[PDB]
Every structure is written in C-alpha cells, then in structure tokens.
Design a protein around this ligand. Structure first.
Ligand SMILES: O=C1C[C@H](NC(=O)c2cc([N+](=O)[O-])ccc2C(=O)O)C(=O)N1
Ligand SMILES: [Zn+2]
Length: 110
C-alpha cells in the first residue's frame, strides 16, 4: 500500500526507532503474549525477530522466563532509557528474539 501508517515502531517517550511491523514474530503461534513478572506487573508483549535502538543490560538470566528455553536481558531504549522489553537468547528456532511491551512503543509511518 502507498504511504502506510503502521510500519515502524518507535520509543513512545523519545521517538528512537526500535522495530518494524514486518519483523513481528509469532512465537508459539501468536506474536502477542500476555504475561506477568514477579512484581505482578502485567505486560502485553509483542515478539519481534529484530530490533534496533536498544541497550541490553546485565547478564542473561533464565529465571522466570516467559519463553521456554530462553534466557532474558532487560532491553532499554538506547536513547532515553525507557524499559521497552527484553532480549531473549539461548533457545532454538529462533535462537534469539525480542519481546517488547506494546504500549511503550508508538506505531507509525516509515
Ligand atoms: O521473561 C521474563 C522477563 C521478565 N523479567 C522481569 O520482568 C524482571 C525480573 C526481575 N527479577 O528480579 O527477576 C527484575 C526486573 C524485571 C523487569 O524487567 O522489570 C520476567 O519475569 N520473565
Ligand atoms: Zn526512548
């Protein structure tokens, strides 16, 4: 389609380019996963094969992982430090991917 308006995801706080609709990844059959952390925070997580503009913090941990076989690291916006989701590694098919918090991204035109 000409002039699409739902093609790129940016950080909601600062506008840093983060990912693309084209890179949505249907993990376990769905790109959306509704999950909670040990602090009880509920997230609507969209899985992406690739992302950019993030900064991954700390060492990978398997503890409390929402995706079996994957270890996670916190993914912050590399520009503003907003916590945008997690990077997953150490699994299979794919080895790595990103789980990003949908409401912390803004979707818009390329
Ligand atoms: O796959 C995953 C990722 C997620 N991780 C977290 O939410 C998390 C866990 C801890 N911690 O001390 O273990 C501290 C901070 C956070 C945070 O990201 O705020 C989770 O629980 N399962
Ligand atoms: Zn940001």
């Amino acid at each position: 389609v000409l002039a699409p308006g739902a093609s790129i995801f940016r950080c909601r706080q600062c506008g840093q380019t983060i990912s693309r609709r084209d890179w949505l990844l249907p993990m376990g059959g769905d790109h959306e996963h509704v999950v909670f952390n040990p602090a009880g925070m509920i997230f609507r997580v969209w899985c992406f094969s690739l992302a950019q503009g993030l900064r991954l913090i700390g060492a990978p941990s398997g503890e409390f992982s929402w995706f079996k076989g994957y270890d996670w690291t916190i993914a912050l916006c590399g520009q503003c430090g907003s916590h945008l989701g997690w990077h997953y590694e150490g699994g299979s098919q794919p080895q790595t991917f990103f789980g990003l918090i949908k409401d912390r991204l803004a979707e818009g035109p390329a």
